[PDB]
Amino acid sequence: RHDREFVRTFFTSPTAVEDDSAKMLRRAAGLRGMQAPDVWVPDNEDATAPSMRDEGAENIVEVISEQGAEFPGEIHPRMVWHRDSPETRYQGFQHMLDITDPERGAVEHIHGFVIPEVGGIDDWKKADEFFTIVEHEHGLDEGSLAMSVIIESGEAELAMGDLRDEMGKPTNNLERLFLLVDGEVDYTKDMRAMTPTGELPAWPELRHNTSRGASAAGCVAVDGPYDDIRDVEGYRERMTDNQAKGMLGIWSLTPGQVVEANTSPLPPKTGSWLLDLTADELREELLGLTSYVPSMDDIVDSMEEFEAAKWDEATYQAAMTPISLFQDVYENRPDQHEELEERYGAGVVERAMEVG
Amino acid sequence: RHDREFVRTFFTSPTAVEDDSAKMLRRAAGLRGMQAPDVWVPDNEDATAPSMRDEGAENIVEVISEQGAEFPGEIHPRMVWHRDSPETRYQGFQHMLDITDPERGAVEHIHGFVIPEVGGIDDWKKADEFFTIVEHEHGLDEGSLAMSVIIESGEAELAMGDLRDEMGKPTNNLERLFLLVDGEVDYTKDMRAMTPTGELPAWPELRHNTSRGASAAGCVAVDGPYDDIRDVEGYRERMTDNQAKGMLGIWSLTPGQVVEANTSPLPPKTGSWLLDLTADELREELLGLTSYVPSMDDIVDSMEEFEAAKWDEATYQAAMTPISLFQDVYENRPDQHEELEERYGAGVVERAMEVG
Amino acid sequence: RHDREFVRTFFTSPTAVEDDSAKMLRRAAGLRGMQAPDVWVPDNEDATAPSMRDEGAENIVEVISEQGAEFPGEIHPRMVWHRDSPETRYQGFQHMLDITDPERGAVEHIHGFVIPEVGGIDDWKKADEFFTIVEHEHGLDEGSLAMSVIIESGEAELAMGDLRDEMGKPTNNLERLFLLVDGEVDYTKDMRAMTPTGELPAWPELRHNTSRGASAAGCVAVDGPYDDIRDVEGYRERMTDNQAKGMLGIWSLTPGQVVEANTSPLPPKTGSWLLDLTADELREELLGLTSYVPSMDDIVDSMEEFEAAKWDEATYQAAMTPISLFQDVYENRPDQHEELEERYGAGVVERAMEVG
Amino acid sequence: RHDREFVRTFFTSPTAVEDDSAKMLRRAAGLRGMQAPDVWVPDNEDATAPSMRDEGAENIVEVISEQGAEFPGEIHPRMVWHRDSPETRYQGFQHMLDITDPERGAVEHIHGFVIPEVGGIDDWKKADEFFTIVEHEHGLDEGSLAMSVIIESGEAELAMGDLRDEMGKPTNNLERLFLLVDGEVDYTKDMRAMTPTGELPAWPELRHNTSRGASAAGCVAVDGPYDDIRDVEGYRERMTDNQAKGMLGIWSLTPGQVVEANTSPLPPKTGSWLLDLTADELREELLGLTSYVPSMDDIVDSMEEFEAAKWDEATYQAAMTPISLFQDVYENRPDQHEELEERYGAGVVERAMEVG
Amino acid sequence: RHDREFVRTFFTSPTAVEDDSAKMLRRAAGLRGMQAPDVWVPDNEDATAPSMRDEGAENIVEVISEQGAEFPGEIHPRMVWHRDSPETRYQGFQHMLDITDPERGAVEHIHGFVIPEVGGIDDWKKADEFFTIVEHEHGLDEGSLAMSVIIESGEAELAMGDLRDEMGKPTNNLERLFLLVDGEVDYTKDMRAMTPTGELPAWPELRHNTSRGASAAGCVAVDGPYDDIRDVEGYRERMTDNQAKGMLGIWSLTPGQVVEANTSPLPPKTGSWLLDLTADELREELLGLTSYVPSMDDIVDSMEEFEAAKWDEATYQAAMTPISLFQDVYENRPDQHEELEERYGAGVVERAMEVG
């Protein structure tokens, strides 16, 4: 259905940083060769602060208009969307309409849009309908804008199961679907999962399911952000694990990740047989080798700080899980207040209840 | 939809032990603090012998009437049910009707009921309809009794996929759904699985799927019984694995498990950094460290014993898998009788065929 | 629904080898005891060269007519089929019709047929309808031919979810379904997966899902080919892993595998407790212990060879994945041609583009 | 699926009249020959006053036990049921359970039960489940009690469309379905229809749809009560119209209707060619020829009377339609009170508002 | 989807009359102008005796090869098919395959095929799959053969409701659907309807429903055979009634009907205002004005005759309805044998029971 049968790299850039707010886009747009992504995603949702998103959409039109023709990969900006926020949906749609105004010269270099936070199949149809309306409002060919989604809810994971048959209904244009991209960060929160370090679970079933959804429906599966940018070995191992599920693309957050991800699924240059101090302040190998499990006090410290500063929003949300749980317990189990105060001291308890 | 946004512990108690048959309930009802469950489940199904289940339902009304007001958690007794037994369904429904007679004073302290052995979504609706009828027979608010299910069949696992949309149909009241609880013990038998030791498979996909079903439908996911009560470390590791799937509650079988499970998902009191004889008859550390793989002779010994005594019923059923398989082979492969007798000796063979 | 409640072994034989083309069948038909499969599958699809498949179907009728009565297991030949090839479907159906001509004496010893490469549930119905027509064309009892399928697509994996309810519709006879068999080889290609060595991924979710589909629908789950015939230990470990998912049967490719698979799910003869040079050119233990990761040059060498000879077809297809990917990249990323030539040298590049 | 391929007559009898309350049943049970129905329906729902329905169910067991063996047609008593009343459902189920106690000797002469007021297909399943439970509670063969439904809601009319496929699901026993019977009286009220005289609309589409539902699903279609017992010509014309839709059975309310309905679909005794005072107080031919359109005053008179006496309940409900409408208008259109009082006088208005 | 946006006339011809069996086809093929149909249907099903249908399919290839190029309308032969006969389905498919052999020169003048007696939507898919296989077996363009169906069952009428969404599924090619044609003759029997004269009911709902199905799915609605060929006025009135439902085409059985039907939906040549012996043996105006209602004796006479001669088969089937009903009554109501013998005399009764 789409020109790229495989996509190796899916690279996001912030659209407006709060200087030239568009600086990140103009540089990403100059990337070439192995450093340039099969798919580049100017990112008007999680990569860009919310107060900056209207300037972000302006910057997307400015840059793609100016540099879009020369970009060697395909361009699919990510808009705002949420299955549970009609205001967010309408926002994304308004931005899409602006960005594709043919008089501004960007649309002709835009292959499609990425829609995050989608829900059940009826939510996907609402995004599709916006695509169709944008196309008709600006005289584009029907179906010419590809839609890609980020799978970051239980709901969306289940929705991939019924796609082949829903896609063929005549009341939608969902043949425009292109990529199915996992969003482990938000999926973790939607699932209310938690780990001692805050590292993301690996969610091998999700990735299996997205790979399968993609092959059943004629889409392309892509894995989510691997945000420990220094862990080049870990990134490679994830990509290899993914390739064994038939998920041959991955999200990249830097141009070095892009190079690594562009190279990983290609056959090696030479064969190999497998069988059954030292520097100085380069002992930051130990930062690589360590991880920290925070206490209640730490998490509450951190949150209090982040709330006053209002750790990015996703870190804050991840912490909110165990804290929301602590607070549900405290509200509903008066019989446990004594063991809890004794467990954490009352300083912390009452502070944990103020957080959120 | 329900008051408890999180549930950490789901603790079952037998309802009639064959002295005061209700003794286990009266003590469980006195538990407080960290030893008391978020959800307490007086258990009229697998925890209670079948000849005792009618006295069990009487005991549930006596105890909850007498001690129910003071119980710090929520009370959700488990009734009998089976997707393939209309008599069992009707039994559970009769017990539910008795237990909730408002003149007996228990119902006002009962938040809902737990229904085991459910099947496809149409079986869930049959349980729901019984709830609705009980509510109307006794003037309770419609939807005031929460329903929780145990997922212990392939059928039920698949049914979670279609819940969001089935729940909204006007011919049911399935918005009453609260917990989705895995039942690994019976699920193992429904799946006809088997292990060399008889240890339960870990069934990570089931737990993933139940976690996902819960987040898609507004329910709460809970894992099943960890019956090796001495293996406190194993219990903790399972809980941690679960938390990484977004399954933050677990079944508890003793008040010590309850303490462990009540504490596990709470943040630690202090931080930690991670990196890449001796006693005497306390060498029962070796019982902890060992496991035994039985032979055909052992299993048939055991079964013959258990059948004469008629190892609990679930152990017997687990054994029945390889034995049923041995017997299917023997009935259908006369060409294999010689290698089989030679394999086990004829003593055993003919005994294996009498078992069942 | 079917006579065999359990099936341990599913053993395929080529139907026409290009001497007596039927030689493999006549020998397989003589197997007895532990060396003989619960289910024997004369294989007219992947085990038999395509130019030989019409003689294959003749050989199936000759041998089963001659030796079929004495065969101790059940006989279910595999026909050609493909969800995306109407010509292949019609071929399989024509062969089935010939094979079951009651005047040729084979049908009375044939329990059913195996259908590979099935897709969504509507494709399964197309196979079912062919069964029904064959039955009526030859006066067989309706439903007397069992249908077994090979699950080797994402589509088919998803289709198992809706089977219980689709099976009961009156417009089909899908109660004839017997085995659900995983086909990891082709499933790997349908999923576009790849591994460094070319070893098959383990696909634990697929096997979980097929086991679950089987228990939900009254079918029997069977795992796919373990083609490293020398790795007897690996075969045993896979069977044990499978048994823990409730997949108690497995495909066997030699009579020794048949013995191993016939023995594996039976209880051991004696108990066991578990706890927490040397020869000469027998150093082929090292062939067992090694594996090779090929380079681009190797893969392209190999393919060029195989294409000229036109490594079996499935190996060729597995290689086609990374090469198809390399070629999609080359066609769409002119900006990457320099780093690619430098990576592999231009000899290889232009050769990689000729392959396919 | 059922013994009677055609059913001509469906004759209801009250079960307890408030003397021998069972008198009507004992006589109906003696009917023979053309005066006896293909299907006799001891009627514990609309034919029997609600305060009498528990004695009604007792009378059904007494009479059928005593006279049931000799009855020449099939016996299918009608139980209470309502799609919107869980208490009514449970009542019907309790009565069914009592009536079929095999120790009372009625069940062996009962072919099935008639369930009125059914809704969407999920409500039909709730009735089916009660049947299945009754069968298992009393050791009857599964599926031996036929279920017949009365179609008297929009919901039920739509439900016939999806029956063939819902009937085959393994979670129900709806193959027990036998008759689909129109209930024009209640259907009229469910549809909120009204006529100037109070005569029932003819509802030709309903009858078409029920006929079609019956042929699509292997059931038998039957039309509803023709309560103008003296209008023998009208009854014949309705039966002829019905026969032209493939609805070959009809409800009968007297033994004379039974004779007429038993005779109508049989071929005439001789052929016929078609082409393009007088007595005295026998001028009650004029009662036959007239009908009366009541005024608001009449209807309110009547209702006030009926409410004080608390015209049967169905007449009262039919009147409630225009009156409910008048009252919705009065509550919501204060701007219309003057034209309304002038239209009816205020005597009536304020009385019309007290009615209901 | 298809070239003809409207179809006025759908004219059937027998394919082999038992002289030149193909005589009827060769003449129909010469029709031109107003006497020639928009759609001509060489009819290998009900118009042709069953013993003649294999020569019929040969004749279709001979004539269309010889005269097909010059035919001014579109050619869509009707094949045999039945929802409940796998042998009939396979027959139709075999004939379709022969007829479209491109080496015989007919296919290039064949626009599609007409499939009668279709059932639920899954039966329509079975016909579609045969089309797809025929296309691929002979190198035709996929979808180039239009499929038209005859709606002559309750099942098929209900199936039109779900067509838009089923048509878009990727496992079928049902976008090939062209005409939806009512078959009142067989639909009458499927519905088990009956009239005093044997005239067909008008079935206005069916026609409404088929018209609606056609507009919902992008198909064209056509009414069924009006077999009283002399009643030119009646034919016109039916066509006008149809046009008011949006069913603008009708079946034609003679070239005069073709002229009438070709002219009816065209605007009149001049305007008109509407407002609120005589010959000799031309008194066959009375045959036009009369109709005969047969007795039991007549019908049984007739059937006995027709059975010995074995009134066409459809007349015989129509009679079978009341007779099947009489026989169900006689088998099940021994209490009615006396009134029945008295009603018809025993001569007739026992004869009525031998018929069938």
Ligand SMILES: [Cl-]
């Ligand atoms: Cl919303």
Ligand SMILES: [Cl-]
């Ligand atoms: Cl959603």
Ligand SMILES: [Cl-]
């Ligand atoms: Cl993919």
Ligand SMILES: [Cl-]
């Ligand atoms: Cl059941």
Ligand SMILES: [Cl-]
């Ligand atoms: Cl079930």
Ligand SMILES: [Cl-]
């Ligand atoms: Cl949860």
Ligand SMILES: [Cl-]
């Ligand atoms: Cl295809």
Ligand SMILES: [Cl-]
């Ligand atoms: Cl498919």
Ligand SMILES: [Cl-]
């Ligand atoms: Cl899944």
Ligand SMILES: [Cl-]
């Ligand atoms: Cl299985």
Ligand SMILES: [Cl-]
């Ligand atoms: Cl209700």
Ligand SMILES: [Cl-]
């Ligand atoms: Cl309803």
Ligand SMILES: [Cl-]
């Ligand atoms: Cl009928």
Ligand SMILES: [Cl-]
């Ligand atoms: Cl059939």
Ligand SMILES: [Cl-]
């Ligand atoms: Cl059908």
Ligand SMILES: [Cl-]
């Ligand atoms: Cl039309």
